């Protein structure tokens, strides 16, 4: 039973760490995506004003 309890706790810890790591990289990718979208939106709006001028 002690061996089983130690193994179960070890499995839970590694799974939790892996999930947290996966979530963090996903958030980092999303933040990088947001910056690119903002740059594209800024580029579009300056392009439109030049045509209006």
């Amino acid at each position: 039973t002690t061996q089983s309890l130690a193994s179960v706790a070890y499995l839970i810890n590694t799974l939790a760490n892996n999930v947290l790591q996966m979530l963090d990289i996903q958030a980092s990718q999303l933040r990088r995506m947001e910056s690119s979208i903002n740059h594209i939106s800024q580029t579009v709006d300056i392009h439109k004003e030049k045509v209006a001028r």
């Binding site: 740059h39 800024q42 580029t43 300056i46 004003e49 030049k50 001028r53």
Partner: protein
Amino acid sequence: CDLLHAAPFQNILPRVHVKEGERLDAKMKRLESKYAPLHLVPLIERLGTPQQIAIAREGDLLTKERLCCGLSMFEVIL
């Protein structure tokens, strides 16, 4: 009115009062140094992505150049 609000970020300073004892050049240089952080282009140039530099330069060019700086259209209509 719109251009008036963009003066701080374009190094557009007014004519400050100068009295006996000091010259215009020294006062203007001190005043420019005081408002240096507000100026945008060099702050982006020193640190910032090239894309940010290009966007800021284009935005500054569009804002400074407008149709009340020696441009009219009533003559064309006539």
